[PDB]
């Protein structure tokens, strides 16, 4: 059985069509989830549940090593709050093509009702069309003062997720690099996609966006259309990105956009469609 940081181990459901598999997590491990915060509490990122579901893909659907991993129709919500240290517990549990992902304490505080819901979606897996070298587009454009990103995004994010490496922008789309580092690097291939290089490619459209409108009250992923991932285990990416059209020009309370990923010789590793952003409010988080 192949284990997995985020999705632990296979464990016995009592629903009969289910699979299900629990891990525990703390903000001490895996270590990237030590490192985001909103409103100062340590609080799990959306990516955690979009590799859980892709992961979860490649396990219980059967398939070729070349297929691509499929999920679709994804919503996060209800940000699961980490206390530094303290372990909790994370449930994917999956019927037919559906998945969902609970959290729980350990010692638990009612058994099944105990359980919070965070993610919900629909896995598959496909052989598609070969993918060719070379299919990274050319943008020529102004490059993304990224220190001063870094600088006001602080206050959300440590050392260990600032992957950017240079970011363009020709309106609203950009190409940008994105590269792991130490232990993240060292980790990438015991994930799917790993988290913190996904949270780079969402924090390049978090850049386009903040250039116009506050960073507080920060945009969070609601969900996503679809997500395919060609190749595993990636640590460096060069990704197209693409803001959809906001409502309004100073302020805007959500945001759309799709990303195509692609390997430093331009092959494509992942493609996002209709990531959904909605900024976060503080009340009732603690």
């Not at 010692?107 to 993918?131: C, F, K, M, N, Y």
């Not at 993304?144 to 600088?151: G, K, N």
């Not at 409502?247 to 430093?264: E, I, K, V």
């Amino acid at each position: 059985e192949r284990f997995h940081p985020l999705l632990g181990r296979r464990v016995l459901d009592p629903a009969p069509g289910a699979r299900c598999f629990t891990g525990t997590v703390s903000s001490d491990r895996p270590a990237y989830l030590g490192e985001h915060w909103v409103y100062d509490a340590i609080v799990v990122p959306g990516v955690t549940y979009l590799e859980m579901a892709l992961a979860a893909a490649s396990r219980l659907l059967p398939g070729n090593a070349a297929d691509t991993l499929i999920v679709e129709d994804v919503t996060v919500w209800s940000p699961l709050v980490l206390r530094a240290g303290a372990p909790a517990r994370l449930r994917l549990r999956s019927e037919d093509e559906r998945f969902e992902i609970h959290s729980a304490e350990p010692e638990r505080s009612d058994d099944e009702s105990a359980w919070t819901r965070h993610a919900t979606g629909r896995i598959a897996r496909r052989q598609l069309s070969p993918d060719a070298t070379g299919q990274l587009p050319r943008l020529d454009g102004e490059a993304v003062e990224l220190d001063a990103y870094y600088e006001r995004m602080r206050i959300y994010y440590g050392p260990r997720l600032r992957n950017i490496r240079h970011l363009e922008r020709r309106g609203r789309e950009a190409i940008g690099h994105v590269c792991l580092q130490g232990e993240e690097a060292q980790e990438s291939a015991s994930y799917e996609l790993h988290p913190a290089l996904l949270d780079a490619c969402f924090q390049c459209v978090f850049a386009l966006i903040y250039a116009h409108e506050s960073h507080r009250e920060p945009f969070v992923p609601l969900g996503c259309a679809r997500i395919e991932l060609r190749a595993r285990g990636v640590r460096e990416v060069r990704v197209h990105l693409r803001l959809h059209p906001p409502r309004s020009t100073d302020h805007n309370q959500t945001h759309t956009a799709d990303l195509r990923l692609f390997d430093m010789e331009g092959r494509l590793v992942a493609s996002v469609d209709a990531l959904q952003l909605k900024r976060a409010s503080k009340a009732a988080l603690l």
